[PDB]
Design an enzyme around this catalytic site. Structure first.
Site, short mmCIF file in Angstrom:
data_model
loop_
_atom_site.label_atom_id
_atom_site.label_comp_id
_atom_site.label_asym_id
_atom_site.label_seq_id
_atom_site.Cartn_x
_atom_site.Cartn_y
_atom_site.Cartn_z
N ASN A 89 7.96 -1.97 -20.04
CA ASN A 89 6.48 -1.72 -19.73
C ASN A 89 6.49 -2.08 -18.11
O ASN A 89 6.92 -3.44 -17.66
CB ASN A 89 5.61 -2.89 -20.56
CG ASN A 89 4.12 -2.81 -20.12
OD1 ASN A 89 3.25 -1.93 -20.09
ND2 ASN A 89 3.98 -4.05 -19.38
N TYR A 155 3.50 6.49 -7.95
CA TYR A 155 3.54 6.20 -9.14
C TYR A 155 3.48 7.73 -9.89
O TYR A 155 4.28 7.61 -11.13
CB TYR A 155 2.12 5.63 -9.40
CG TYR A 155 1.85 5.06 -10.90
CD1 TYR A 155 2.38 3.92 -11.08
CD2 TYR A 155 0.90 5.75 -11.77
CE1 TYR A 155 2.08 3.20 -12.63
CE2 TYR A 155 0.58 5.20 -13.05
CZ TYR A 155 1.15 4.04 -13.24
OH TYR A 155 0.73 3.40 -14.60
N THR A 190 -7.98 -3.06 -18.54
CA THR A 190 -7.20 -4.12 -18.19
C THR A 190 -7.81 -4.54 -16.80
O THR A 190 -8.88 -4.23 -16.18
CB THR A 190 -5.78 -3.80 -17.72
OG1 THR A 190 -5.76 -2.54 -16.59
CG2 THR A 190 -5.03 -3.15 -19.02
#
Ligand SMILES: [Mg+2]
Ligand SMILES: [Mg+2]
Lengths: 248, 248, 248, 248
Positions: A89, A155, A190
């Site tokens: 992760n 990313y 988050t």
């Protein structure tokens, strides 16, 4: 319980989706090797697990450093005897920056953590699992492993790369009892997304069919299933947890 | 002539697919900046272009070095005055090695050339093209940008990463006159591929619906079309030239 | 128990994957409306459910007939009071026949069962679920919803069509409490598949990274999870259960 | 010229993208068999071609009727001796209607024209091409062959189905020199989209990276390339002409 008696490692487990993954693995009966680059956050995740009667240890690692992965494996074998499950992760997006303005350091850092760090983990994990009869690896990719998101070229490339390395590992090691899959969260509730404006969050929400952001438990639940013996014919695959994002 | 008066840059143009792309660009009327890590090979492609009456120059660049991309842009500006087209052709997959045995150096080299070098090139090319009204970029990916190939985890990762960064860049620059797309060749009859046993080629052939390997001109034809004003509504997309490989 | 108190409908539940889905739904605590074109087979699955203490009924439907779907909804409402979950499992591929020799009757039958029957079912199920707050639908597609398989053009077309209608329905009903996803099995050890020569199975096995065929329970486990509240952020998406088939 | 000396059939050629495809095929030097269900519109397309010095004939067909395809083949052989190229271009979306409100007639009509009509054409075309040494078929799919668009479940299923049948035909007939590909236009500036409000058109435009709708020539240019000998290693593939639609 999905994971009774199995030993699982989670990277980036000090916060966010990784922390929930760790807590869920332990709730499902797994022994957990919690890892993070932050000892403070990592140890807090460990304390969360132990406070609910779970069995876990903390081991520091910078996943961009190959050598730190050997220490993770070592910790698993030493505390619990074997590695059954691993979840790679990782990092964050970085700052939103158009490609022409993205610097060498931004490209290198995001690639380092979100792609190279996944390869280094997967390489160490395979080795470990081959010794004790196989196991299951889950790589946290993203919707950015399937589509592009402006401002985060690094990313996007990284998260696509994770989807790819899942495919080749599955074929290389399927005979030998290693399953490997990627999970593709969309926008999840988050810290980073919690700090943006209601208007921006509504905009993100509207990019999902369910018209809300996901919760970290919704991602972890999937990860736990894919890590379990219920998933025994599932490998080489991308599993969205995207609220319908990719479907339009 | 698809490309009359256009100026094109081709990386990895010293041999194989990249050499043919460069020649086909010149044959379609573009000026060509030939690049390659190998100056001898790059000079050869230049010689073949010039032999047919084409306008071209050669400029050495290590495409893994961000700073060398500036020298390529500058060469285009010095010889022909602007940059209209760029093809980031990049390299080869390296030696087939299972993931658990793949070294840090293997991973870093293949990522550097086939992924980071493409990002550094796309970054430089965007900047240059924005100065003169836009242009067209074609990134050579692979079938390995869509499926896994055993033994080449690093290449699979890189080539998936290329498909991703194409998507982001397309949205970032689509209103500013830049088109960018990826091309996915399957196995192509290059010198490297030519030397493998009739048996191993017969095995690669059978993985294509056309039951043969592709020719470099079959790739280059697509690249030329995608680089041209005929492709004016085509951006952000992956264009196989795979003889059916992905269709099963 | 993933599904305590839920009421589920399963089409094509008389044998193979659909029979196991139905049993696994009951084992996870749901009430089950068993359906199939074959009443004998459907009654058998009902008998196996009831034998274990499950709550179930059988209702005949030809799923290719739009009107029969009303009888299925009604059976769920009559026996258990509502519909919470539906699995549209549909049928088989028919005989392998190259496209140029495939008859009108072949095309129309396979489309009717594997595509139109799924649409008529999804339509009926949406209407029913909207009455009581929503629910979850799982459409069984295939690897043939993502790649081609020689000799089964009609099935490939249908199963791709299933992946598409899942995407649309997810956006249409995502705000109204309905999740819908597709499942893509590869070759599964059903009775049909069991009878083919050890050679032909060895050939099908080798097309999976796990180098074996799947079991019906491996499919059903996924279906049950996707039907459950654990999957609350999962919609519009395709979930392979393919042992790595699509990854090369 | 891309298509000098080749004979091409186009369906749905009386209007829109099909008309442009026909005109472009003829501009590229092909003899064209224009087909439409409308004789008036079909004959006008023929007159357009002949007025620019092209060689063509008109043949009526309802592509949803299998028998009409044999008449198309017959016309090609009779006028021009052989069929080299075929483009299965088809119907429209239908009315935007949520799935729960979509009627049997809407599902059946859209499926009939956009999927079954493509299968019937492809089946007849294969037969014809096998007699004169192969050829090239292009199927007009849509972005709706890859993503979902609310309100048009039938078209989405149909357009996905076209993508699938392309895959299996490519493998069935690749050995025998038939290439087959699908093309995926996004929103193109044709009659239906011309009649909607500036606000709605701006909304559509904004779903493309290029921030405009496409022109019918931008689609035709692709179709012509894929139909040509330049595309000789291209089969089984989906070629977007989507202005970046799928990339986010
Ligand atoms: Mg999208
Ligand atoms: Mg494959």
């Amino acid at each position: 319980m999905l994971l009774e008696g199995k030993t699982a490692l989670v990277t980036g487990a000090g916060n966010g989706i990784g922390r929930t993954i760790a807590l869920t693995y332990a709730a499902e009966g797994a022994n957990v090797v919690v890892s993070d680059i932050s000892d403070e956050w990592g140890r807090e995740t460990l304390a969360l697990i132990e406070g609910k009667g779970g069995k876990a240890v903390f081991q520091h690692a910078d996943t961009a450093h190959p050598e730190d992965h050997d220490e993770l494996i070592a910790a698993a074998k030493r505390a619990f005897g074997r590695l059954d499950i691993a979840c790679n992760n990782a990092g964050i997006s970085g700052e939103f920056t158009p490609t022409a303005e993205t610097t060498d350091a931004q490209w290198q850092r995001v690639i380092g953590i979100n792609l190279s760090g996944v390869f280094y983990g997967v390489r160490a994990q395979i080795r470990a699992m081959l010794e004790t009869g196989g196991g299951a690896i889950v790589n946290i990719s993203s919707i950015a492993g399937q589509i592009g998101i402006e401002g985060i070229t690094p990313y996007t490339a990284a998260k696509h790369g994770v989807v790819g390395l899942t495919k080749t590992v599955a074929w290389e090691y399927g005979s030998k009892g290693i399953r490997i899959n990627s999970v593709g969260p969309a926008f999840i509730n988050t810290t980073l997304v919690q700090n943006v404006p209601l208007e921006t969050r509504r905009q993100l929400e509207q990019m999902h069919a369910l018209r809300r952001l996901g919760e970290t438990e919704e991602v972890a639940n999937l990860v736990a299933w894919l890590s379990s013996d219920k998933a025994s014919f599932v490998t080489g695959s991308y599993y969205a947890v995207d609220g319908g994002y990719l479907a339009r």
